[PDB]
Structures are given as structure tokens and as C-alpha cells.
């Protein structure tokens, strides 16, 4: 049984199925869980999940208190309910996250330390309630560094991925490799729901929805200020609505991706049909980011009626580089109010820094960019309105900037290079 939620957009968008869970509650204390943050509740949570799924589904409930746990592995038809004043406290002991599981790390498929909340090929999975996800960060802060053995592991992963070595031979949870695990990583799932809860820090990517089809993300209060902490990362996913969330980030708010180079070309699964509305960025560098990992294709993305009241680097930022191939098509931003920004819109087709020297270019393939649309945007103060840097070998096409007003411009209005069919309509600015 399902409701369906209708979503308006400038492209076709099917209504989104929302599972109605069976009215059954599996309390983790009935399977041996103990609060206070020192008893390890990994096994109790797993036993509650097994019983719920065997019964046909329902809620696995974490009541008020602090509950220490290792990873939580979903099965189908489970809603993990965090009650008000519940805190899931995750351990920072790497051995609790073994054995390794199938995942994707910075756009390359591999086996790594289990994500803290992990779902693989499930249907009808949810996290809900007014409680909090709160990982311990001690060990993971140490793993922010990039010493020699960590660089060796990144090279190993990239070489295997780039030469089509089977994913099971990409075993990364070994020795000092030190690839940090995701907070939420849902992989190849159908009918996802995330509703109501708080996030306080994350070891790696905060909310990773990877190769998923159909879902809703709403009423979230996300705060994470460590390394590689975007608010939400959609990767090779489709048919999602995001609404009514707040983002307070070390990096960007909403980011759309589709993997890195050859490994992604192999998977051939674009990220598409995602709508974001009524959201708010409080801290962070970018409101809507596309890429740099876009290799599988990105198409039909719509953000509207959102705010960024404080200060950002780039409000709308589209990125790729010469290794990526793929395409970026039909990206829309509408009805956004901004405080301060360095750029309102930027397109940069050669963003390559950390991976520039570490590994080689196996193949140059220039990304096709077509249809980037910004309408009804205000910014109080900007260094520049927009800056577009295309590749001469395959220029960017069809960019529209319309009903855009900037209260004060500090450096320059615009700079354009290797872009065709740029349409500016009713742009207003002031400058001195
Ligand atoms: Ca790079
Ligand atoms: Ca690369």
C-alpha cells in the first residue's frame, strides 16, 4: 500500500510512491538494547530489524536516551524511527565496521568499511522521527589527513576502476588505507523516505543516495563541519523530491553526481528527475552543485523557492573536467533569494586539483553541456554575477539568465568564454 505525491516541474515527473508502513513497533530494548552510550547495541538493533522484516515490516524504534552502536544494516520494509530526544551514537572503532561491504567512494565502486547506516538492494526503507544521528569523530578526524599509505590506496582504487577490474577485487579496508565510511549510504534501493530527524557531524559523505529509484527527503536539520560533508549527495539516482530541509555545512548544500570517468561509463546510469523546493542553506560554499563527478550523465534537475541568507562562494555551480565525458542537460534554478555571494552562477569545465597529479588521464573525453537556466534570482552583494568557462573543443550551449537583480557588484558583471546561445533577459545591477 502506497500514497503518491505530485510534483510540478518543467519536465515530465511521475508522482512519487510513499510506503504506508504496517502498524507494528519493534522496540530495540525488547532485543537487549541498553542506553547511556557505553553498551554496544549493534546486535540488538540487528535482531529488531530481522524480526520486523520477518513479520512483513513496520517500525524499528529507538526511544529517548543515548544509544551506542556500530553499523546498522537495513532489510526491506523497515522504518528506523528516532523518537524525540533519542540519540544514535556511532562508535569510531574501525573494526566495528568490518567486514567490508559493496559501496562507492568518491565516484568509484569498491568494498570498504560499512557505512554507518547501510541499505543494499532493499525496497521501502526509511529513517524518521525527531531524534538525532550523532557519530563519534575522534578516529575519523585523524583519517582527514592524506599520508603516503592513504594516497597509495586512492591510486590502487582508481587504477582498478579505470581498467575494469571486478568490484570484488577492490578490497579497500586493509592496513592503513583509511577510506572513511559514509553516514547514510543507500545503494540500489527503491522507495526511500527520510523525514524529520537531526544530523550532527559525519565521518565522510553525510547522505549518499546511490543508484536509487523513487523517494522523498524532508524536514531534515543537517549540521556537519568536517571534511567532505555536503548536505545531500545524489549519485546515479532518479525520481526524488527534497523539501523543507535546513543545511549547515563545511562544503555544499545539495549536490548532484554520476561517478568518476570509466567506472561510471561502465555503469551507464544517469542522475535524473530530482526536484528540490523550500530549502535553506545557513552555512556552506554552494547552494546547488553539479559535479565534478558527472560521468554517467546528469539530466532534468529543478531547484525552486529556496534561500541562502548569509554568505556563499557560488550560488549555482556546474563543474567537470577533461577526463569525465558524459553530459549535463536541463538544469533549472528559479525563485531564489541570496545575501552575499562571490558568483551567482559559475560554469567551470576544468576543475581538477587533488586528483591532478596523483593519477594519470586514461582518456580525454569532453563533457557535453546543454541547457542551464536561472530565472528570478536576487542577490544583495556579489563579486560577479556570472562566470562561464567552456572548452573550445566542445562549447557549452543554451544558458539563460533571466529576471536576475544584484544590489551591488564588487568586481565585474560577467565573463564568458566558449559558450554558444547565451541569453540574458532583464538583468539589473549596480556597481562602483
Ligand atoms: Ca580533482
Ligand atoms: Ca579524476
TrEMBL record:
<dbReference type="GO" id="GO:0005975">
    <property type="term" value="P:carbohydrate metabolic process"/>
</dbReference>
<dbReference type="GO" id="GO:0016829">
    <property type="term" value="F:lyase activity"/>
</dbReference>
<dbReference type="InterPro" id="IPR012334">
    <property type="entry name" value="Pectin_lyas_fold"/>
</dbReference>
<comment type="similarity">
    <text>Belongs to the glycosyl hydrolase 28 family.</text>
</comment>
<dbReference type="InterPro" id="IPR011050">
    <property type="entry name" value="Pectin_lyase_fold/virulence"/>
</dbReference>
<dbReference type="InterPro" id="IPR051801">
    <property type="entry name" value="GH28_Enzymes"/>
</dbReference>
<keyword id="KW-0456">Lyase</keyword>
<protein>
    <submittedName>
        <fullName>Pectate lyase</fullName>
    </submittedName>
</protein>
<keyword id="KW-0326">Glycosidase</keyword>
<keyword id="KW-0378">Hydrolase</keyword>
<dbReference type="GO" id="GO:0004650">
    <property type="term" value="F:polygalacturonase activity"/>
</dbReference>
<dbReference type="Pfam" id="PF00295">
    <property type="entry name" value="Glyco_hydro_28"/>
</dbReference>
<dbReference type="InterPro" id="IPR000743">
    <property type="entry name" value="Glyco_hydro_28"/>
</dbReference>
Amino acid at each position: 500500500q502506497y500514497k503518491t505525491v505530485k510534483v510540478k516541474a518543467p519536465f515530465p515527473m511521475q508522482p512519487i510512491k510513499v510506503f504506508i508502513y504496517p502498524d507494528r513497533d519493534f522496540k530495540i530494548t525488547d532485543f537487549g538494547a541498553v542506553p547511556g552510550g557505553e553498551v554496544d547495541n549493534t546486535k540488538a538493533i540487528a535482531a529488531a530489524i530481522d524480526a520486523c522484516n520477518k513479520a512483513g515490516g513496520g517500525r524499528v524504534v529507538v526511544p529517548a536516551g543515548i544509544w551506542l552502536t556500530g553499523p546498522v544494516h537495513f532489510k526491506s520494509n523497515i522504518n528506523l524511527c528516532l523518537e524525540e530526544d533519542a540519540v544514535l551514537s556511532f562508535t569510531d572503532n574501525p573494526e566495528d565496521y568490518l567486514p567490508a561491504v559493496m559501496t562507492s567512494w568518491e565516484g568509484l565502486e569498491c568494498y570498504n568499511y560499512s557505512p554507518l547506516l547501510y541499505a543494499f538492494e532493499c525496497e521501502n526503507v526509511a529513517i524518521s522521527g525527531k531524534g538525532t544521528l550523532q557519530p563519534k569523530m575522534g578516529t575519523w578526524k585523524v583519517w582527514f589527513k592524506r599520508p603516503a599509505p592513504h594516497l597509495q590506496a586512492l591510486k590502487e582504487l582508481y587504477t582498478k576502476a579505470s581498467t575494469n577490474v571486478p568490484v570484488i577485487e577492490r578490497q579497500m579496508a586493509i592496513g592503513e588505507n583509511h577510506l572513511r565510511p559514509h553516514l547514510i549510504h543507500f545503494n540500489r534501493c527503491k522507495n526511500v523516505m527520510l523525514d524529520g530527524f537531526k544530523i550532527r557531524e559525519s565521518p565522510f559523505w553525510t547522505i549518499h543516495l546511490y543508484m536509487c529509484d523513487g523517494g522523498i527527503v524532508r524536514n531534515l536539520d543537517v549540521r556537519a563541519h568536517g571534511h567532505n560533508n555536503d548536505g545531500i549527495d545524489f549519485e546515479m539516482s532518479r525520481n526524488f523530491l527534497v523539501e523543507d530541509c535546513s543545511f549547515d555545512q563545511g562544503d555544499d548544500a545539495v549536490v548532484i553526481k554520476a561517478g568518476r570517468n570509466q567506472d561510471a561509463w561502465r555503469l551507464n546510469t544517469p542522475c535524473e528527475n530530482i526536484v528540490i523546493r523550500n530549502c535553506r542553506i545557513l552555512k556552506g560554499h554552494t547552494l546547488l552543485g553539479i559535479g565534478s563527478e558527472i560521468s554517467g550523465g546528469i539530466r532534468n534537475i529543478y531547484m525552486h523557492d529556496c534561500t541562502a541568507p548569509n554568505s556563499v562562494m557560488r550560488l549555482f555551480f556546474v563543474k567537470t573536467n577533461h577526463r569525465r565525458g558524459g553530459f549535463i542537460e536541463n538544469i533549472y534554478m528559479k525563485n531564489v533569494a541570496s545575501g552575499t555571494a562571490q558568483r551567482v552562477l559559475e560554469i567551470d569545465t576544468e576543475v581538477l586539483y587533488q586528483w591532478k597529479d596523483l593519477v594519470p588521464t586514461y582518456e580525454k573525453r569532453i563533457t557535453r553541456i546543454d541547457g542551464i537556466y536561472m530565472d528570478k534570482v536576487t542577490c544583495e552583494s556579489a563579486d560577479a554575477v556570472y562566470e562561464l568557462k567552456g572548452n573550445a573543443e566542445l562549447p557549452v550551449k543554451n544558458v539563460r539568465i533571466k529576471d536576475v537583480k544584484v544590489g551591488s557588484v564588487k568586481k565585474f558583471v560577467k565573463k564568458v568564454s566558449n559558450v554558444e546561445n547565451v541569453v540574458e533577459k532583464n538583468v539589473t545591477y549596480s556597481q562602483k
